[PDB]
Design a protein around this motif. Structure first.
Motif, short mmCIF file in Angstrom:
data_model
loop_
_atom_site.label_atom_id
_atom_site.label_comp_id
_atom_site.label_asym_id
_atom_site.label_seq_id
_atom_site.Cartn_x
_atom_site.Cartn_y
_atom_site.Cartn_z
N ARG A 27 0.82 -1.21 0.00
CA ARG A 27 0.00 0.00 0.00
C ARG A 27 0.86 1.26 0.00
N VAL A 31 0.84 4.24 -2.97
CA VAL A 31 0.72 5.70 -2.86
C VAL A 31 1.97 6.38 -3.42
N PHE A 34 1.71 6.40 -7.00
CA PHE A 34 0.68 7.36 -7.40
C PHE A 34 1.28 8.75 -7.55
N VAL A 35 2.16 9.13 -6.62
CA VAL A 35 2.80 10.44 -6.75
C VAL A 35 3.92 10.41 -7.80
N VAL A 37 3.99 8.82 -10.56
CA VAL A 37 3.44 8.94 -11.90
C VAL A 37 3.39 10.41 -12.32
N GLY A 38 2.88 11.27 -11.44
CA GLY A 38 2.86 12.69 -11.75
C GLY A 38 4.24 13.29 -11.86
N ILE A 39 5.15 12.90 -10.97
CA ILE A 39 6.52 13.41 -11.05
C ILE A 39 7.14 13.06 -12.40
N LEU A 41 5.63 12.22 -15.10
CA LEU A 41 4.90 12.87 -16.19
C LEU A 41 5.42 14.29 -16.40
N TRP A 42 5.62 15.03 -15.31
CA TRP A 42 6.20 16.37 -15.44
C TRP A 42 7.58 16.30 -16.08
N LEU A 44 8.85 14.01 -18.04
CA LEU A 44 8.77 13.61 -19.44
C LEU A 44 8.22 14.74 -20.30
N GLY A 45 7.28 15.52 -19.78
CA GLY A 45 6.84 16.71 -20.49
C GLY A 45 7.99 17.67 -20.73
N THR A 46 8.77 17.95 -19.68
CA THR A 46 9.94 18.79 -19.84
C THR A 46 10.87 18.25 -20.92
N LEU A 77 8.06 1.32 -7.16
CA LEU A 77 7.18 0.80 -8.21
C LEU A 77 7.46 -0.67 -8.48
N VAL A 81 4.74 -3.62 -8.05
CA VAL A 81 4.38 -4.50 -9.16
C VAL A 81 4.57 -5.96 -8.78
#
Ligand SMILES: Cc1cc2nc3c(=O)[nH]c(=O)nc-3n(C[C@H](O)[C@H](O)[C@H](O)COP(=O)(O)OP(=O)(O)OC[C@H]3O[C@@H](n4cnc5c(N)ncnc54)[C@H](O)[C@@H]3O)c2cc1C
Ligand SMILES: CCCCCCCCCCCCCCCCCC(=O)OC[C@H](COP(=O)(O)OCCN)OC(=O)CCCCCCCCCCCCCCCCC
Ligand SMILES: CCCCCCCCCCCCCCCCCC(=O)OC[C@H](COP(=O)(O)OCCN)OC(=O)CCCCCCCCCCCCCCCCC
Ligand SMILES: CCCCCCCCCCCCCCCCCC(=O)OC[C@H](COP(=O)(O)OCCN)OC(=O)CCCCCCCCCCCCCCCCC
Ligand code: HEM
Ligand code: HEM
Ligand code: HEM
Ligand SMILES: COC1=C(OC)C(=O)C(C/C=C(\C)CCC=C(C)C)=C(C)C1=O
Ligand SMILES: COC1=C(OC)C(=O)C(C/C=C(\C)CCC=C(C)C)=C(C)C1=O
Ligand SMILES: COC1=C(OC)C(=O)C(C/C=C(\C)CCC=C(C)C)=C(C)C1=O
Ligand code: SF4
Ligand code: SF4
Ligand code: F3S
Ligand code: F3S
Ligand code: FES
Ligand code: NA
Lengths: 125, 113, 243, 235, 238, 113, 113, 125, 125, 119
Positions: A27, A31, A34-35, A37-39, A41-42, A44-46, A77, A81
Motif C-alpha cells: 500500500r 501511494v 501514485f505520486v 506517476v505525476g513526477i 509525467l512532469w 517527461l513533459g519537460t 514501483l 508490481v
C-alpha cells in the motif's frame, strides 16, 4: 455511560507476520507510485518539450538528489508490481494460501524486489 | 454502491483493478525494455521513440489504466484511514482531479511531440 | 339484493381514538374489520386533546391504582359503575405501555421514563397530597395518540372506508343487529356492511347546543342510530359544560 | 364540552337493554366504545384525563373479547331484504323533499332552545317549555327539505342526516334532564339543588320506543377492592 | 363591509369544466371572522357549495385551501389577511392534486406518498426493556417539530417538485415524517429506511425552494428535515 | 438507477454535481482573473495565454466537468418538464451528444493552437 | 449489474446501444455521402476533407460511439458463446483494450493531420 | 369515470416567495449557460484559428448585438454561479435554512449578481 | 447418477425460419464490422500519414485481394446496419411483430442489403 | 400468480371491464409444452438465466392483468440484463407455437414497460 470505553490499539505492542509487512509496504508503494506517476509525467513533459527542454531535463536528472528520488521511485514501483502480481496469482489460484506458502511468497517477492531495485539503480546511475 | 468511488460493487472494482493492473504491467514491461536496450540515450533517439504512433497510443492507454487503478486504490485507502467525511471527500476529489490532469497532460505532451 | 353488501367480521362506525384502537385490537386477533369514518381517520375530534392520559404508571412518583380508582369514583359523584372504573384503573398502565411501544412520542423524565404532570382532581392515599399521574405529550397528547393509532392501523393494513357516512343500523327479525347501511360521501352511493359485530364509536354530540368545544362532526350520529334501532341511551341528563 | 353518557354497555362493550322487566340483556351484534358508549366510568362528572384512558382501555377490551362475544351471541340470522329499506327510508325521505322547510333554521332554533333551557342552569317549567319547543321543532324537522341534490360529495345530505341525529340526541337529553329530580354532578337544577341518595343514587335510562324515562341500579361492587360507600361532596 | 368572493366551482354531474362564480356576503365591521366562517355563511345561502371543515381550530388539517394564491387553513385565516381594497377574495383548491367537488381535492397521492415511507416505529425485539422504552430528554427534544404534522397537504400542494412528480417525489410532509422516524431513538432499523429512500426521485428532488415553511400552518420546517435526510444519506452511502 | 442519466443514485448525482461545480467555479475564477488583468488584448497575448500547457489542460478539465454537470442538470430538468418518454429520450440524447461534441471540439481547438 | 460489462442493467444497455447505433448510422451516412460525391479522389481532396474540424470531431464522436456499442455487443456475444469464466474475461478484456486503442489511434491520427 | 378529474394548476393564480424565484431563475440560467458554453466554444475556436480568424472573432464581438448577447450570457452565468454556491453552502451547513435566512441569502445573491453583471458589462463593452 | 444426462442439441437436425437467419447473420456481421473498424482505422491512418503514405494506401487498396476484403467489409456493415435499423423499428413499434410481418421485413432487409452491397462494390471497384 | 395487496376489497369478485379482460387473451392459454423455449437459441445458451418465451408470456399476462396491484415489484424483478432482454426477435416460438400464440409481442410489451418505468 458518560465517557465511551477505551480500546487497546497500541500498534507498538501488537506483532505482525511477514505477510502483513508485505501488504502494508504494498500500500505504501502504491501511494508512492501514485505520486511518482505525476513526477515522471512532469519530467517527461519537460524532456519532450524541445531540445533545450531535453537538456534541462537531463541536467535535472543529473542531480545526486534527483538520482536518489528516481531510484526510490523505481524501487517502490518495482516492489508494488511484484507484490501485486503475487497477490493476483494467489487470487487466481497459482499459489497456495497457507501460512508457509504465504511467507515463502513474501520472501521471494522481497528478494526479487531487491534484485529489480539494484537493476534499476544501475540504470538511473 | 458507495456513490463516491469509480466502481459499482466489489466484483466491479476487483475486475477493473485486475485488468488495469495487467495493462500497466504490460506498459512497464515495454518501457523497461526500451530503456534497457536504448544504450546511449540522446534527444535524437528520445524523439524518435516518442514520435511513433504505437508508443504514444500505448502511453495514453497506460495513463487511462493508471487513472482507473489509482482511483480505486486511493478510494480504498481513504475509506480505510479517513473517518471524517468532508476530509475524505475532499481528498478523493483532489486525487481524482490529479489523475484526470495526469491523463490530460499525457495527451497535451504526446500530441505535442 | 338491490343494494350492494360488503361482508366483514366486524364494522367499527368511527375512526376516533377508541374507534381505531378497538379496530386494531380486533384486526390483530385475526378478524376482518371495516373501519368506517365520516372524515379522515386523523381528523376526528380526539385530535384536539391536550391534557393527557391519566394513569398510575408510577413513573413520576410511587403510588398504586386504587388511589386513582377512589379519585375517579369520588369525582363521578358515586354514579359510575365501580367494577368498570376498577377494571379501567387496573388496566391503564399496561394499555399505556403498549401504546408507548406502538410509537407514541411521550415526554420523558430525566431517567428516560414517560413523563406525567400533576393534574387537578388527583389525590394521594384516597384524598391526601397531590398526584402527578397524568401521562401525556407536551401539548399534543391526543394528536399524537390518534396519529400513532392511525400509523399502527396502516402498518397492520386495516380495511378503512374513509369518508363513508353510516346511515343506520340493520337488525334481523330476531332483533340482532345484522349490520349497518352507510353512504359513500365522495361518490354518493349506498352500501350495507354485514358484520356480526357492529361497534359504534361516533363520539360526542355537543353540537346540539349554541356553543361547544367539539368539532363540527360531533352530531351524535351513533346515539341517534341506536335510538332508531331501539337501544336505550343512559345518563343523557348529564353533560359536562365549561363557562 | 363532554357527553357523560350514551349507549350503556358492559366492561367489554356489549350494549345492554332491558325488556319488559328491567333486567339487562346484551343486544346481539351491537357493540359500543369511546365517548358514545355510556360505560359509566365518569358518572355525573368526568375527570380531565380519564377520557383518553377510557377510550384506549375499553376499545382494546372490546377488541380482545370480540370472539368471546360472537360465540356467546351464537349464530345470527341474516337480514331481510326489507330491512335495508326500513333503514334507508330516512335517506329516501330526505332526498324526496324538494319543498320542505329550511334545515339550517331548524338547527338554529333547536340549538337556541337547548342552550337557553338545558345548560348548566336548568329549571322545572323552563325545562317543560324546552320540551314543548323541542316537540314543535321535531314535528317541523319531520318536513325539512334538501335544496341541493347532487351526487358527488354532497355535503348537504350529510349535514341533513347529522341534523336528524342532533335532533334525536337533543330530544333524548331534554327528556333525561327534565326527568331527574335532583342536583348531582354537572346536572344541577334550580328547584332541587339537593343531591339525594335515597332515591336518585342510580343511572337514568331512556326508553326510545315509548320515549320514557326509567331508573337503573349502579354497580357498586368491585372485584379486587372493597367498594366505596357514598359520601358528602367536598369543595 | 360587503365581502366579495370568487370561488372555484365545479360539479362532475352537471358541468363540463371548472369555473369561477362570484359571491357577496356582508359582515359586521366590529368583529373579524376567519375564512371558514364566511364559507359557512355563504354555503348557508348556496347549499351547492362544498368544503371540508372538522376541527374549526386548525389542529386536524381539513379545510386546507389556496386563498389569494397562498395555501393555508380557512379556519385560522381572518378576513383582514384576504380582504383588500378593490380586489376580490379568490378561493381555489390546493394545486396539483385532482379535484373532486367545489373545493375538495383528491388527496390520494399525498397519503400514498406518506405511506411509502413506512411511517411507524420499527423495533427488532432483542434487548426488550422492562417497560416503556427509555430515551433521555434530549432524544425526545430531537423529535420536536417532526411529529406535529396535521396532514393538511398545504406543504406538498405548494411545491413545484410535487406538481411535477407527485408519485415519485415524496413531498415535504413525507420527508418530514421520514426524518422524524429516522432520528427517533426507538427504532433500531434506520439503515433499512435509508436504503429505502436513497432514490434519485424520492428525496433529492428538493431544491430548497422553501415554500412549505412559508405556507406551513403549524410553523414547521420540512426544509431542515430534508437537509438532515440528505446529510444522513451522504454519511451512509458515501 | 434510471438507466438514462449519467448517475447511479441520488448521492452519486449529488456528489458529482457538487464536485464538478467546484471545478467549474475554479475555472471561471481563472478565466475572469485572466480577462481582467489582460488589459489590452491582442492576438499576440491571446495566443501566448492559450499556448501554455496549464491553460489548455485546465480548459479541457473544465470542459469535462461541464459535460458531467450539464448532463446531470439537463436530465433533471427534462425529467421535471417532459412527460412524454420518446421526446424526453431524444432531447437527452441530443444534449449528451452536444456535450460530447463540446469536449471533442475543445480538444480539437486546444491541440490546434 | 454483472460487474464486467459497460452497462448498468437491461434498460441501460438497451438505451446505450440504440443511441450509439443512431450516432453510428449518422456517421456512416456522412462518410458514404462524402465518398460518393468525391468523384476523383486524390491526396489533395483527402487532406482537405480530413482537415476540417467538423470531419475530425465527427470521426472522434463516431469512434466513441463505436467503443460503447462494440463493448456492449461483444459482452453479449461472449456471455452467449463462452461458458468458461477466465477465457471469457480475457476475451472481453482484449476487446475493450482493442476498442480503447481504436479511440486513441483515431485521435493520434486526427490531431496529426 | 368517463373523463378524468380537473386539476387547479393555474400558475397565474398561485404565489411564490423570493426563494422560489431564486431557484427558478437558477434553472433558467443553468440552461442559458448550457447553450452559452457552446456559443463561447465556437467563438473561441474562431479566435484561436489564426490571426485572420482572431480578427474575424474580434469584429463579431464588436457588434452591438453580439455585445448584448455576450453581456446576457455573462450575467446569466454569474447569477447561476452565485445562486449555486449559495445552495451548496446551505447544503453543507454554512447557512441556516429558515425562511428569514433563505430570503436574506436570496437578496444577497441578487445584489451580488447585479454587481457581477455590471462588472462583466464594463468588460464586454 | 454417475454420468450426466445427454442433451439433443444437434443443430444439423433442427430447422430455423428466415427470422433466425436474419439475427444470426446480424451477429456475424456485427463481429465482422468490429474487426473491420480496426482494419479501416489502420488503412486511414496510413492514408492520412503523408503523401507517400497516401500513395502506399492507394496501392494497397488497388490489390484484387484488398478489393475483395473491402467489398466484403462494406457488405457486412451494410447488412448489419439495415438489420439493426429493422430491429430498432420493430422495438419502437413501427413494424408488426407477427410471423408474416417478420418474414416480410427479413426479405426486404435482404433485398436492400443486396442493393447496398452492389452499390458499394461499384465504389470499391 | 395474482398479487393483490388487500385494501379497497370489492364486495365480490373483482370488477374488470370487458376490455381489461380482452387485454388478457393470448396470454393465459399457455399449455406449457415447452415447444417455444426448446426452439430458441437464447434458451439453449442460457436456460437458467434467460426466462424463455413462455416465461415472458406469463410474466406479461400477470403484469397487464388489472387484478394485481403490484406491477412495480415484478418489473423490478425482471429488469436484469439476462431475464428479459435476451430476446433478439428470432420469432421461432410464434413459428412453432401450437396454440397460435405470440410471445414476441409479449416480450416487446415487457420491454416497453421496462423502458417506460426504469428510463
Ligand atoms: C376540545 C376538546 C379537548 C379535549 N381535551 C381533552 C384532554 O385534555 N384530556 C382528555 O382526557 N380528554 C379530552 N377531551 C375529550 C376526549 O379527548 C374526547 O372525548 C375523545 O376525542 C373521544 O374519542 P372518540 O374516539 O370516542 O371520539 P372521536 O375521536 O370523535 O371518534 C369518532 C369518529 O367516528 C367518526 N364518525 C362519527 N359519526 C360517524 C358516522 N355517523 N358514520 C361514520 N363515522 C362517524 C368521526 O368522524 C370520528 O372519526 C377533549 C375533547 C374536546 C372536544
Ligand atoms: C512507470 C514508468 C517506468 C519508466 C521508468 C523511468 C526510467 C527513468 C530512467 C532515468 O533515470 O533516466 C535518467 C536519464 C539520465 O541520462 P544520462 O545519465 O545522461 O545517460 C543516458 C544514457 N543511458 O535522464 C535523461 O537523460 C533525461 C530523460 C528523462 C526520462 C524521463 C522519462 C519519463 C518516462 C515516463 C514514466 C511514466
Ligand atoms: C465560462 C467562461 C468565462 C469566460 C467569459 C468570456 C469573457 C468574454 C470577454 C469578451 O467579451 O471579449 C470581447 C473582446 C472584445 O475585444 P476589444 O473590445 O476589441 O478590446 C479588448 C481589450 N480589452 O472580443 C475579442 O477581442 C475577441 C476575443 C474573443 C473571446 C472569446 C473567449 C471565449 C472563452 C471561452 C469561454 C468558455
Ligand atoms: C464505417 C466506415 C464507412 C467508410 C467506408 C469506406 C469506403 C472505402 C472506399 C474505398 O474502397 O476506397 C478505395 C480507394 C481506391 O481509390 P481509386 O480506385 O484509385 O480511385 C478513387 C477515385 N474514386 O482507395 C484509396 O484511394 C485510398 C483511400 C483509402 C480509404 C480509407 C478510408 C477509411 C475510412 C475510415 C472508415 C472507418
Ligand atoms: C502505474 C500506476 C499505479 C498506481 C498509481 C497504483 C496505485 C494503487 C494504490 C494506491 C493501490 C491501493 C493498495 C491498497 O489499498 O492496499 C493499488 C492497489 C493495487 N495495485 Fe496498483 N498502482 C499502479 C500500478 C499497478 C500495477 C502495474 C499493478 C500490477 C499488478 C498493480 C497492482 C495492484 C493490485 C493487485 C492492487 C490491489 C491489491 C489489494 O487490494 O490487495 N498496481 N494500486
Ligand atoms: C459551466 C457550465 C455549467 C452548465 C452547462 C450548468 C448546467 C446546469 C443545469 C442545466 C442545471 C439544472 C439546474 C436545475 O435542475 O434546477 C445545473 C444544476 C446545478 N448547477 Fe450548474 N452548470 C454549469 C456550471 C455550474 C457551476 C460553475 C456551478 C458552481 C456552483 C454550478 C452549480 C450548480 C448546482 C449546485 C446545481 C444543482 C442545484 C440543484 O439541483 O438545486 N453549475 N447546472
Ligand atoms: C460501427 C461499428 C459497430 C460495431 C463494431 C458493432 C458491433 C455490434 C455487435 C458485435 C453486436 C452484437 C450483436 C448481437 O449480440 O447479436 C451489436 C449489436 C447491435 N448493433 Fe451494432 N455495431 C456497429 C454499428 C452499428 C450501427 C451503425 C447500428 C445501427 C442501427 C447497429 C445496430 C445494432 C443493434 C440494434 C444491436 C443490438 C441488436 C440486438 O441485440 O438484437 N450497430 N453491434
Ligand atoms: C498489513 O496490514 C496492515 C495495514 O493495512 C491494512 C495498516 O494500515 C497498518 C498500520 C498502518 C497505517 C495505519 C498507515 C498506512 C500507511 C499509509 C501510507 C496509508 C498495519 C500495522 C498492518 O499490518
Ligand atoms: C422555484 O420552483 C419553481 C420551478 O422549478 C421547480 C418551476 O418550474 C416553475 C414553473 C416553470 C416552468 C414550468 C418552466 C421552467 C423553465 C425552464 C427553462 C425549464 C415555478 C413557478 C417555480 O416556482
Ligand atoms: C438466430 O439465432 C441463432 C443464434 O443466436 C442466438 C446462434 O448462435 C445459432 C448458432 C450459432 C453459433 C453457436 C455461432 C454464432 C456465431 C458467432 C460468430 C458468435 C443459431 C443456429 C441461431 O439460429
Ligand atoms: S408541516 Fe406540512 S404537512 Fe404538516 S401541517 Fe405543516 S404544511 Fe401541513
Ligand atoms: S405459447 Fe405455445 S409454444 Fe409457448 S409454451 Fe405456450 S403452448 Fe408452448
Ligand atoms: S424544494 Fe420543496 S419540498 Fe421543501 S426543501 Fe424546498 S420547499
Ligand atoms: S429471441 Fe426467442 S424468446 Fe421469442 S422474442 Fe425472439 S423467438
Ligand atoms: S378547520 Fe378542520 S383543519 Fe382547519
Ligand atoms: Na359518554
Amino acid at each position: 455511560v458518560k465517557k465511551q470505553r477505551p480500546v487497546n490499539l497500541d500498534l507498538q505492542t501488537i506483532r505482525f507476520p511477514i505477510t502483513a509487512i508485505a501488504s502494508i509496504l504494498h500500500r505504501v508503494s502504491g501511494v508512492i507510485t501514485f505520486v511518482a506517476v505525476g513526477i515522471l509525467l512532469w519530467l517527461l513533459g519537460t524532456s519532450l518539450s524541445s531540445p533545450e527542454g531535453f537538456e534541462q531535463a537531463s541536467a535535472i536528472m543529473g542531480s545526486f538528489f534527483v538520482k536518489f528520488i528516481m531510484w526510490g521511485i523505481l524501487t517502490a514501483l518495482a516492489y508494488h508490481v511484484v507484490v501485486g502480481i503475487r497477490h493476483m496469482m494467489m487470487d487466481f489460484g497459482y499459489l497456495e494460501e497457507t501460512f508457509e506458502a504465504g511467507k515463502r511468497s513474501a520472501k521471494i517477492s522481497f528478494v526479487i524486489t531487491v534484485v529489480l531495485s539494484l537493476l534499476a539503480g544501475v540504470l538511473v546511475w | 454502491s458507495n456513490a463516491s468511488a469509480l466502481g459499482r460493487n466489489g466484483v466491479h472494482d476487483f475486475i477493473l483493478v485486475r485488468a488495469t493492473a495487467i495493462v500497466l504491467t504490460l506498459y512497464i514491461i515495454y518501457m523497461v525494455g526500451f530503456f534497457a536496450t536504448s544504450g546511449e540515450l540522446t534527444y535524437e533517439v528520445w524523439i524518435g521513440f516518442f514520435a511513433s504512433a504505437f508508443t504514444k497510443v500505448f502511453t495514453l492507454l497506460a495513463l487511462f489504466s493508471i487513472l482507473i487503478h489509482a482511483w480505486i486504490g486511493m478510494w480504498q485507502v481513504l475509506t480505510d484511514y479517513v473517518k471524517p467525511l468532508a476530509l475524505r471527500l475532499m481528498l478523493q476529489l483532489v486525487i481524482v482531479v490529479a489523475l484526470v490532469v495526469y491523463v490530460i497532460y499525457g495527451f497535451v505532451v504526446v500530441w505535442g511531440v | 339484493m338491490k343494494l350492494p353488501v360488503r361482508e366483514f367480521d366486524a364494522v367499527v362506525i368511527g375512526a376516533g381514538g377508541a374507534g381505531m384502537r378497538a379496530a386494531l385490537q380486533i384486526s390483530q386477533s385475526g378478524q376482518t374489520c371495516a373501519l368506517l369514518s365520516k372524515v379522515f381517520p386523523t381528523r376526528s375530534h380526539t385530535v384536539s386533546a391536550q391534557g393527557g392520559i391519566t394513569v398510575a404508571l408510577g413513573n413520576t412518583h410511587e403510588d398504586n391504582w386504587e388511589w386513582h380508582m377512589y379519585d375517579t369514583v369520588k369525582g363521578s359523584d358515586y354514579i359510575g359503575d365501580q367494577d368498570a372504573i376498577e377494571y379501567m384503573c387496573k388496566t391503564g398502565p399496561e394499555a399505556i405501555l403498549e401504546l408507548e411501544h406502538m410509537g407514541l412520542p411521550f415526554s420523558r423524565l430525566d431517567d428516560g421514563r414517560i413523563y406525567q404532570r400533576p393534574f387537578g382532581g388527583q389525590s394521594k392515599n384516597f384524598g391526601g397530597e397531590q398526584a402527578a399521574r397524568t401521562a401525556a405529550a407536551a401539548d399534543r397528547t391526543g394528536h399524537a395518540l390518534l396519529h400513532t393509532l392511525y400509523q399502527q392501523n396502516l402498518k397492520n393494513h386495516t380495511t378503512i372506508f374513509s369518508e363513508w357516512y353510516a346511515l343506520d343500523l340493520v337488525k334481523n327479525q330476531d332483533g340482532a343487529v345484522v349490520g349497518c347501511t352507510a353512504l359513500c360521501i365522495e361518490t354518493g352511493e349506498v352500501v350495507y356492511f354485514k358484520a356480526r359485530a357492529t361497534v359504534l364509536a361516533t363520539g360526542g354530540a355537543g353540537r346540539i347546543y349554541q356553543s361547544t368545544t367539539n368539532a363540527h362532526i360531533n352530531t351524535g350520529d351513533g346515539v341517534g342510530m341506536a335510538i332508531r334501532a331501539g337501544v336505550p341511551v343512559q345518563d343523557m341528563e348529564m353533560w359536562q359544560f365549561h363557562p | 364540552h363532554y357527553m357523560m353518557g350514551g349507549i350503556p354497555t358492559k366492561v367489554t362493550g356489549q350494549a345492554l337493554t332491558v325488556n319488559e322487566k328491567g333486567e339487562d340483556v346484551v343486544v346481539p351484534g351491537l357493540f359500543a366504545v369511546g365517548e358514545i358508549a355510556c360505560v359509566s366510568v365518569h358518572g355525573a362528572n368526568r375527570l380531565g384525563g380519564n377520557s383518553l384512558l377510557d377510550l384506549v382501555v375499553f376499545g382494546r377490551a372490546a377488541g380482545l373479547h370480540l370472539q368471546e362475544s360472537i360465540a356467546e351471541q351464537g349464530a345470527l340470522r341474516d337480514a331481510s331484504e326489507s330491512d335495508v329499506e326500513a333503514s334507508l327510508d330516512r335517506l329516501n325521505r330526505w332526498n324526496n323533499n324538494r319543498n320542505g322547510e329550511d334545515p339550517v333554521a331548524i338547527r338554529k332554533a333547536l340549538q337556541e332552545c337547548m342552550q337557553h333551557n338545558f345548560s348548566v342552569f336548568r329549571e322545572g317549567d323552563a325545562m317543560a317549555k324546552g320540551l314543548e319547543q323541542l316537540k314543535v321543532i321535531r314535528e317541523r324537522l319531520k318536513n325539512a327539505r334538501l335544496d341541493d341534490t347532487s351526487s358527488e360529495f354532497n355535503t348537504q345530505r350529510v349535514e341533513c342526516l347529522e341534523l336528524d341525529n342532533l335532533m334525536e340526541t337533543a330530544y333524548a337529553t331534554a327528556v333525561s334532564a327534565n326527568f331527574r329530580t335532583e342536583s348531582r354532578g354537572a346536572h344541577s337544577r334550580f328547584d332541587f339543588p339537593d343531591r339525594d341518595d335515597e332515591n336518585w343514587l342510580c343511572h337514568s335510562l331512556y326508553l326510545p320506543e315509548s320515549e320514557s324515562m326509567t331508573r337503573r341500579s349502579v354497580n357498586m361492587e368491585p372485584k379486587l377492592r372493597p367498594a366505596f360507600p357514598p359520601k358528602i361532596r367536598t369543595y | 363591509m360587503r365581502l366579495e368572493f370568487s370561488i372555484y366551482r365545479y360539479n362532475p354531474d352537471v358541468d363540463d369544466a371548472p369555473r369561477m362564480q362570484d359571491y357577496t356576503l356582508e359582515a359586521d365591521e366590529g368583529r373579524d371572522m376567519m375564512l371558514l366562517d364566511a364559507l359557512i355563511q355563504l354555503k348557508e345561502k348556496d347549499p351547492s357549495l362544498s368544503f371540508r371543515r372538522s376541527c374549526r381550530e386548525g389542529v386536524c388539517g381539513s379545510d386546507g385551501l389556496n386563498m389569494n394564491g397562498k395555501n393555508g387553513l380557512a379556519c385560522i385565516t381572518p378576513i383582514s389577511a384576504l380582504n383588500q381594497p378593490g380586489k376580490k377574495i379568490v378561493i381555489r383548491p390546493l394545486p396539483g392534486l385532482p379535484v373532486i367537488r367545489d373545493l375538495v381535492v383528491d388527496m390520494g397521492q399525498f397519503y400514498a406518498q406518506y405511506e411509502k415511507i413506512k411511517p411507524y416505529l420499527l423495533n427488532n425485539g432483542q434487548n426488550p426493556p422492562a417497560r416503556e422504552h427509555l430515551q433521555m430528554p434530549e432524544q425526545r427534544e430531537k423529535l420536536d417539530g417532526l411529529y406535529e404534522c396535521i396532514l393538511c397537504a398545504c406543504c406538498s400542494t405548494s411545491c413545484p417538485s410535487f406538481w411535477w412528480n407527485p408519485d415519485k417525489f415524496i413531498g415535504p410532509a413525507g420527508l418530514l415524517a421520514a426524518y422524524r422516524f429516522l432520528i427517533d431513538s426507538r427504532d433500531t432499523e434506520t439503515d433499512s429506511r435509508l436504503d429505502g429512500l436513497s432514490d434519485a426521485f424520492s428525496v433529492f428532488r428538493c431544491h430548497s425552494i422553501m415554500n412549505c415553511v412559508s405556507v406551513c400552518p403549524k410553523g414547521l420546517n420540512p426544509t431542515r428535515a430534508i437537509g438532515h435526510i440528505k446529510s444522513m444519506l451522504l454519511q451512509r452511502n458515501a
